[PDB]
């Protein structure tokens, strides 16, 4: 029961059970369906909804060649980094948006889901890295990070740290440290004369 004139499965991404960790953010290509973004912008359940390069009303009458949906989980105080030209632990080492980002960013508090009583240690983030990430780069490598003069040889030691750290979400945390799920819609508009599309 599937056709090309069907509706895009936006539920699979937003209303998903588990979400990826930010350092290993999950990307889905939305393809071969009718994307109706009215289900999103007419919904008061999101706490952050900011598009860059496009008016959110113009989404339904534009022409896209590729549409990607990135999901992950971070802290509250880190949602401000899911935007072009930002810095911090998430923008430099985990998920970097380009300066010419043409898409949307949708965040919402999921403390009632991604926080367990003793601390949900399934959500991780990269803490150490040599160089910054490129835009949309993904580093799932768990190689020991060398913060000193002598090599580490894949062994946790003095000046030899494991690069991933856990959030440890508990419901008793402040909103700045509660888990926030983030969906990042990226677009690629096709080059055409205005007479064709716009």
């Amino acid at each position: 029961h599937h056709h090309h004139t069907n509706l895009c499965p936006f539920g699979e991404v937003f209303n998903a059970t588990r979400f990826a960790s930010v350092y290993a953010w999950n990307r889905k290509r939305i393809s071969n369906c009718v994307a109706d973004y009215s289900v999103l912008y007419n919904s008061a359940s999101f706490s952050t909804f900011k598009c860059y390069g496009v008016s959110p009303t113009k989404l339904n009458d534009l022409c896209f060649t590729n549409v990607y949906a990135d999901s992950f989980v971070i802290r509250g105080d880190e949602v401000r980094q899911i935007a072009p030209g930002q810095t911090g632990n998430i923008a430099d080492y985990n998920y970097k948006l380009p300066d010419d980002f043409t898409g949307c960013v949708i965040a919402w508090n999921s403390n009632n889901l991604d926080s367990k009583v003793g601390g949900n240690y399934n959500y991780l983030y990269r803490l150490f890295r040599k160089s910054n990430l490129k835009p949309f780069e993904r580093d799932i490598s768990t190689e020991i990070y060398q913060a000193g003069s002598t090599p580490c040889n894949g062994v946790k030691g003095f000046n030899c740290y494991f690069p991933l750290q856990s959030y440890g979400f508990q419901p008793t945390y402040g909103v700045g440290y509660q888990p926030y799920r983030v969906v990042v819609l990226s677009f690629e508009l096709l080059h055409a004369p205005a007479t064709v599309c716009g």
Epitope: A147, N159, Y177
Partner: antibody
Framework: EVQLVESGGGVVQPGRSLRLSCAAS????????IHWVRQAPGKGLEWVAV????????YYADSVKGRFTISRDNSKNTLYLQMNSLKTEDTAVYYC?????????????????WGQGTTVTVSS | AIQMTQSPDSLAVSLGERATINCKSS????????????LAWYQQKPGQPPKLLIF???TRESGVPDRFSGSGSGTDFTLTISSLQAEDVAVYYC?????????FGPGTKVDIKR
């Protein structure tokens, strides 16, 4: 809803020892380094010590080097400061200052959360 | 040790006017391998602990009003309050965290100019 609570301050004779403690809540305490910053009455802020997010790196101020001993207990979400051979020049308020990311030489991101601060008086 | 110096020691300025605080370090706080100056700005009111306003010299901390801005690179730094409010009367410290020991400035007292 995050807070650091100092503890253990009081009056101490010169040369005697006293241990301060600072309890943290509302955030994953084992992910961030913590500092101790003291402030003499009516004088500027002075940095004291720091401990990394695991206890590996501990550095102290030149004015308290070898006299103070910083330590933490990530299982109980508590950090400690062990002061010995106290001077009247150590009389001050002692704040614990949470860092923004660990505490390896080049990973000091500044301190964003501070405690109310416990008071330490050293006088005969 | 990296010695921090602030000028002026006290700046009384009327409300809605701009307040400028400066901070000079004895050594360069700009790290070569990431182009980040390890300079911060703290605000301390009576009876209260300090409060982080600016880190990385120019990045404003989450929850700080837009009238607080930091500038400068290397050794000369400046915290600027574009339109001084009545609630901004406090003591402002700059602090370096490039190398150890971490060292604060002498502090600058800011009061309203009646």
């Amino acid at each position: 809803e995050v807070q650091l609570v100092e503890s253990g301050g009081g009056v101490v004779q010169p040369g005697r020892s006293l241990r301060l403690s600072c309890a943290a809540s509302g955030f994953t305490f084992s992910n961030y380094g913590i500092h101790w910053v003291r402030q003499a009455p009516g004088k500027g802020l002075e940095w004291v010590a720091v401990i990394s997010y695991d206890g590996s790196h501990k550095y102290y101020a030149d004015s308290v080097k070898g006299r103070f001993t910083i330590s933490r207990d990530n299982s109980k979400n508590t950090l400690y400061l062990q002061m010995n051979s106290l001077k009247t020049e150590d009389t001050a308020v002692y704040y614990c200052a949470k860092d923004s990311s660990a505490a390896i030489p080049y990973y000091y991101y500044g301190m964003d959360v501070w405690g109310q601060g416990t008071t330490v008086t050293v006088s005969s | 040790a990296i010695q921090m110096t602030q000028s002026p020691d006290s700046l009384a300025v009327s409300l809605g006017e701009r307040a400028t605080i400066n901070c000079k370090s004895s050594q360069s706080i700009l790290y070569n391998s990431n182009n980040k100056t390890y300079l911060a700005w703290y605000q301390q009111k009576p009876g209260q602990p300090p409060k982080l306003l600016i880190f990385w010299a120019s990045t404003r901390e989450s929850g700080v009003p837009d009238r607080f801005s930091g500038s400068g690179s290397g050794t000369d730094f400046t915290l600027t309050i574009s339109s001084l409010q009545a609630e901004d009367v406090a003591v402002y410290y700059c602090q370096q965290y490039y190398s150890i020991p971490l060292i604060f400035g002498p502090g600058t007292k800011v009061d309203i100019k009646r």
